[PDB]
Design a protein around this ligand. Structure first.
Ligand code: GLU
Ligand code: GLU
Ligand code: GD
Ligand code: GD
Ligand code: GD
Lengths: 448, 448
């Protein structure tokens, strides 16, 4: 239910976490949480926006219009699987996403049965590099074999020999932590306390988690978290309910990154943190499209009305999706510019789309030479063949990056190290302090 | 392709590993290995056999005939998922199986979307006890929280303080080993070398695995293997290619059990082993049905012809499934009694069927009172309601055991400890040496 569509000649499906995951007690009936912006609306919009550009470009896919069938994943293998069934009930050419790795594996375990190439933008698990199990998977981001290596170089940087380790329950935090503990054993690094926890677990689960970490103090101060954002938020939420501040040195994975929605409200118990982030320049182009949107003109995005209400804390009279948590009426002229922050991985969301465009491009030059539009060869489009063209593609990203894939569907990349600190002004922000590229760790010591 | 059917009023689907899993290079095209007997043909036969009995019984389901749609799983999440799609393309009332835990989770992640109760007979992972993720799952066997506890009591029994740990890649060996290492940390037991490996990995993978284990010698002799049978077989296969005998003390999980197909051919490098086995008396009834089968009269089991050939190393002239590995022609009067060994879990395969029968029984007494057959209430049969009746069922097993479920779909059980040794005669066999029931470990010391 609730699907964002756009008709054309070649349809490209996509899964985006429009809402949060269903509470533990609602999983069976599959009722998703609340509306999301960074990981939801912004991605659905960046989907249409990119397509308009590609369908307006004379070089990329001359007389071929790309359509799209976007579906909500709610960041959960169950709902994401419910929607994938819809994709296989014009046929789909391929799928963009989903977000999580555990959710990606699920969707992949199905799509591969119907020969449908899948390209991710945030799934970074090493397990997906195995092409014997996930033949139809590829991504515009590098696996975590490099991130785990980066995180260890940070621990060796400040001579921390005794650290705790916490990861989010799921194929992401686990596959990443195992690679870390494997490199930690070779380096002679001792793991103090080890634990795991879901992202939707009750506060009591975090109370027990936080307590088990404090018991290892003061020798075990540094805490490595190959964790999702909501997992780090829950931990900071427990640090509040208990009344503890500055007792740990948190070092999180890309799940944290420079995301402002993770530490929003808990800047205090979050200060002094060091994080990891896939190098992705903020797309200058998207801000011009998104900020100009209006509740009256935007009609192709079904979840917009629900978004606008929760976005400005107002309700839409008589509307079906009328929010019963606010009482003041929406004017319809509010500015999205207030408290606006672009999706940290917005750049990858776009190149994942271009990777699908050029894929159909090289295939057209090979199967339908000289022709203008789709020919007998690309009717219908063969998925098994499209997979080969995708892997054999290379182009210049939306922001100027180099995009190509290897034999494992993995793409090259690098990281930027962030340090959350209180600036000269009354504000907490993520400061650019360092980078990591091919075993090289350059950290600015006077900035921390 | 190739489906075993039986028509009736209420159809019960089931997944059995008729063939082995596809080699690593054949997973994408989903081409299964060779025919299986213990985990394949015997279970398909035990399926029909039990149904004939239930449909011949006057008390259990009076005038209601149970049918069945059996499908091959090849013991692989991909093929098992391909077949589940067929189940949801008369409708199915529920599903029996599959075998592995990782494969069970896959099938469960789909069936729960269409409200179809699933009952296993060999899936023992602790993860399946979570009813928020697998609401429609239940089993006639207890989770491994008890087996891991049992294996540790065996290590403490002989005062082994330094042991190695190996498990099969997958939700089974992992969820089981983590529970072991958790209890090992509390007991102050040190884990020497730790490793993991798939069951279909190349011999080189086992050569490297075996080598990494020998390097920890002689202090690390005892080896705990929460491993599948084929994983233990591969290890013994490497012990052969290297020329090592009696260097370890292997202690395996139920994946090994008293199975003769695991150590067949490698009795030498397998002697002196101690295993775990779910208490399940060998069904006296099945042997009378199976051994009397004939290649000419058995027509409801499609995979029989293929089985008979590989069973007696002969080929069927002109037949479609003609085996091109043998040259001598099948007489058709060969006895299945030669080298016959009943499936170790044959008892659970049957009660899983009875658990489905009584489920439809209590539901009939409640929704269609007084009626003879199915009424307006059970047309069609509601899966969500059938789930409640199943959980609230209790009966006497085919061999006299107590069968009932708790709020987590788990069933009570106990284990028998086995010791593989060379008897007085020129033969290697699994000897009954002990039992484990509710924290109590009774091991006969003079029998080992
Ligand atoms: N890299 C994480 C997702 C990080 C995020 O987008 O928050 C994963 O593959 O599960
Ligand atoms: N208990 C194992 C299966 C053991 C076997 O049947 O060989 C599992 O749940 O994966
Ligand atoms: Gd693990
Ligand atoms: Gd910022
Ligand atoms: Gd025996």
């Amino acid at each position: 239910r609730s699907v964002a569509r756009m008709d054309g000649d070649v349809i490209i499906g996509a899964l985006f976490s429009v809402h949060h995951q269903p509470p533990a007690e609602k999983v069976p009936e599959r009722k998703c949480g609340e509306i999301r912006e960074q990981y939801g609306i912004q991605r659905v919009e960046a989907m249409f926006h990119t397509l308009d550009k590609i369908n307006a470009d004379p070089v990329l896919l001359p007389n071929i219009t790309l359509g799209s069938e976007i579906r909500d994943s709610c960041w959960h293998s169950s709902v994401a699987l419910e929607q994938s069934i819809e994709f296989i009930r014009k046929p789909i050419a391929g799928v963009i996403g989903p977000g999580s790795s555990s959710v990606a594996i699920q969707v992949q375990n199905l799509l591969q049965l119907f020969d449908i190439p899948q390209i991710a933008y945030s799934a970074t698990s090493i397990d997906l590099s195995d092409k014997t199990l996930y033949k139809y998977f590829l991504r515009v981001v590098p696996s975590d074999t490099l991130q785990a290596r980066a995180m260890l170089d940070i621990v060796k940087r400040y001579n921390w020999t005794y650290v705790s380790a916490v990861h989010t329950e799921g194929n992401y935090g686990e596959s990443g932590m195992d690679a870390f503990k494997e490199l930690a054993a070779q380096e002679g690094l001792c793991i103090a306390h080890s634990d795991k926890i879901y992202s939707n677990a009750g506060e009591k689960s975090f109370d027990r988690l936080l307590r088990k970490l404090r018991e290892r103090l003061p020798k075990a101060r540094v805490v490595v978290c190959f964790c999702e954002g909501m997992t780090v938020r829950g931990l900071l939420s427990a640090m509040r309910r208990l009344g503890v501040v500055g007792e740990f040195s948190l070092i999180g994975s890309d799940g944290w990154a420079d995301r402002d929605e993770v530490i929003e409200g808990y800047e205090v118990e979050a200060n002094g943190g060091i994080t990891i982030k896939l190098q992705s320049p903020e797309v200058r182009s998207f801000d011009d499209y998104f900020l100009k949107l209006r509740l009256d003109t935007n009609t192709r995005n079904p979840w917009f009305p629900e978004f606008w209400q929760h976005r400005f804390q107002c309700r839409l009279p008589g509307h079906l999706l009328e929010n019963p948590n606010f009482k003041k009426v929406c004017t319809g002229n509010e500015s999205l510019e207030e408290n606006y922050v672009q999706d940290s991985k917005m750049g990858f969301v776009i190149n994942a789309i271009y990777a699908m465009a050029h894929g159909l491009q090289n295939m057209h030059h090979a199967l339908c030479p000289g022709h203008v539009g789709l020919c007998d060869a690309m009717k219908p489009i063969d998925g098994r063949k499209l997979l080969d063209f995708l892997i054999k593609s290379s182009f210049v990203g939306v922001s100027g990056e180099e995009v190509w894939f290897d034999e494992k569907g993995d793409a090259p990349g690098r990281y930027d190290i962030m340090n959350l600190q209180y600036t000269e002004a009354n504000r907490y922000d993520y400061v650019h302090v360092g980078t990591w590229h091919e075993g090289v760790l350059n950290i600015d010591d006077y900035k921390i």
